[PDB]
UniProtKB/Swiss-Prot annotation:
<dbReference type="GO" id="GO:0050829">
    <property type="term" value="P:defense response to Gram-negative bacterium"/>
</dbReference>
<keyword id="KW-0326">Glycosidase</keyword>
<keyword id="KW-0732">Signal</keyword>
<dbReference type="GO" id="GO:0016998">
    <property type="term" value="P:cell wall macromolecule catabolic process"/>
</dbReference>
<dbReference type="GO" id="GO:0005783">
    <property type="term" value="C:endoplasmic reticulum"/>
</dbReference>
<protein>
    <recommendedName>
        <fullName>Lysozyme C</fullName>
        <ecNumber>3.2.1.17</ecNumber>
    </recommendedName>
</protein>
<feature type="disulfide bond">
    <location>
        <begin position="76"/>
        <end position="94"/>
    </location>
</feature>
<comment type="function">
    <text>Lysozymes have primarily a bacteriolytic function; those in tissues and body fluids are associated with the monocyte-macrophage system and enhance the activity of immunoagents. Has bacteriolytic activity against M.luteus.</text>
</comment>
<dbReference type="InterPro" id="IPR001916">
    <property type="entry name" value="Glyco_hydro_22"/>
</dbReference>
<dbReference type="Pfam" id="PF00062">
    <property type="entry name" value="Lys"/>
</dbReference>
<keyword id="KW-0964">Secreted</keyword>
<dbReference type="InterPro" id="IPR019799">
    <property type="entry name" value="Glyco_hydro_22_CS"/>
</dbReference>
<feature type="active site">
    <location>
        <position position="35"/>
    </location>
</feature>
<keyword id="KW-0020">Allergen</keyword>
<dbReference type="GO" id="GO:0042802">
    <property type="term" value="F:identical protein binding"/>
</dbReference>
<comment type="similarity">
    <text>Belongs to the glycosyl hydrolase 22 family.</text>
</comment>
<feature type="active site">
    <location>
        <position position="52"/>
    </location>
</feature>
Length: 129
């Protein structure tokens, strides 16, 4: 599923991400935009052979199991394939655990490089929430 900007904002708000750990909704929408272009089916392989999955490009190195990242962890205790669903619940629950682990949203390289210190509120402008 390729979300619309406001559709995703509403879905994220409903799942508890607005101001989660102090991160306003615009941050999450911005991150999703540049990580996956709002596509729940986005996958990308890293050089170390791990793979990023779904709307927020969660990494198999630490967070999910894909059966092919030897010596990795599964901290969200889910198959990585569950992160590709049109239902974003699993991606959101896992993201809450990542953003809580001490490094905040800096765990998402595109957020750090493309959202952080910008006017993220513009990403939810005009949306009915
Ligand atoms: Cl933080
Ligand atoms: Na893993």
């Amino acid at each position: 599923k390729v979300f619309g900007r406001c559709e995703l904002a509403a879905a994220m708000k409903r799942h508890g991400l607005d101001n989660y750990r102090g991160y306003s909704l615009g941050n999450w929408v911005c991150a999703a935009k540049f990580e996956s272009n709002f596509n729940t089916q986005a996958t990308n392989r890293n050089t170390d052979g791990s793979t990023d999955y779904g709307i927020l490009q969660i990494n198999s190195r630490w967070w999910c199991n894909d059966g092919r990242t030897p010596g990795s962890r599964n901290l969200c205790n889910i198959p990585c394939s569950a992160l590709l669903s049109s239902d974003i619940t699993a991606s959101v629950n896992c993201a809450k655990k990542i953003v809580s682990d001490g490094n905040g949203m800096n765990a998402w390289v595109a957020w750090r490089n493309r959202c952080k210190g910008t006017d993220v509120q513009a990403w939810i402008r005009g949306c009915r929430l």
